[PDB]
């Protein structure tokens, strides 16, 4: 025939290709109103993480981010926590965007309202500059993550991390739910037993956009996300389901999880 | 300390290979008498040489490292029924259906399917020789030459020739992984079958516009000791000195060779 052929491309080839790092923070992290969708769903997600990292138990020596994106609003509670930190994604670019806020290079994305924003949930015991050096100084590595990978940071010496954050980033990875449960076990592989797995991400998403760009994205519901975290060897120890969804122009989920689980998992 | 980052240099091509940069930089063919037109002229006229003049013919020619580009398949479709276009990038393939689909987007190939119009003798004007290169191209695939299966395990028939311009240099960090990779198109071929490699010299970096990419830099003896050991028989190989713009490469000319699958 003809055009009758699997291209043989993946979504994680048509990700590194595609994403947009900087298109990506203009249209999901700068905000015209405070009470705009997407304005709502960072600054609940920024909550949880306060409670999680500040309220909530979630402390210790090395936290690994699978799929940070370009951005480092996910970290900003996170270093009160813990004192280093391993940033990754699958895309080049993304890390390179944050390389730059990272170095504080002129062009970085400008986090500061997000900054203040934390340091007031916080309590006001910093300032923002001192906050975002915080952040800087426990960023430690940035590494290529593949979570369809037995091993996601590759054969690298990483020693186990007491907690892995993932926010909005394992829908967008796995194609199908069956990579998802082994994802979920991969990223075991980085943890010490015991250790805390954080998951914030969309419900009955099947795409996302920037701008005329399509991205595919696995739609799970509440129940799907349960049963595979549970059967990845980790105990839920709790699960919040927020109904605000993102504008049609982005994503079509139905609403987002955020859930705290740890590794039953202890290979002998 | 500080680790690294894991990335390889197919991921860094994949992530930042900007196709229309690529086609703007290379094969504009404007009035300056540029480095990049002497080398796009000289390819051609090879391309017409081996295709045309010379009898590498046959029903299947799949085309690796394709690019965003059409020039190196203009001759070709005068002697195959049928083309495969492969490539690592599907932001290059993008490009490349845009062209096949006559889309108005797509890059004015005109000046160059001009060119080769006249190398054939003017047997036909450029519109018909453009219909004649849609109709053949007849798949779109991704190709990653450093498996030991390079277009996966999709069945495809077995070959009569593997053409390959620019693109087993950028796409082997190794000399190990060119052999291999060399072992590895051997695997679409019929025994027999042509193997049609032009490629840069001694070149370990090309550019695009800003960005800067890796490439082997290999002289013709490894080239050729390579390719004998990879399990084909060299039918004849070209140098010549003609090297790119110190903007865009380091190279000391180009090669061209036909080999054949040992049977
Ligand atoms: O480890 C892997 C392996 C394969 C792979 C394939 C595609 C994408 C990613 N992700 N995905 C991300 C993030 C980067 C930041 C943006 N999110 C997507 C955000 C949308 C927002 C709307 C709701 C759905 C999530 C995706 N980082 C990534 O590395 C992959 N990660
Ligand atoms: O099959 C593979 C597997 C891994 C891999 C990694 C990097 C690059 C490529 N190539 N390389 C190409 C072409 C696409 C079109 C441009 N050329 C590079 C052109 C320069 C010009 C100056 C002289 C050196 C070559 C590269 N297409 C590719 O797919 C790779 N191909």
Redesign the interface.
Known sequence: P??S?????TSK??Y???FNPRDYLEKYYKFGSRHSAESQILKHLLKNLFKIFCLDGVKGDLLIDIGSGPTIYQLLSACESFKEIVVTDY???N?QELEKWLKAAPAAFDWSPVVTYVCDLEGNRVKGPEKEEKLRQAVK????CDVTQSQP??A??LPPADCVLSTLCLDAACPDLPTYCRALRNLGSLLKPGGFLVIMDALKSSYYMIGEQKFSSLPLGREAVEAAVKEAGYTIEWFEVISQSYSSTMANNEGLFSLVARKLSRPL
């Open positions: 003809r055009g052929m699997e291209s043989g491309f080839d048509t590194l290709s595609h895309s080049d670019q890390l590595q940035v590494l290529k940071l590759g690298v010496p």
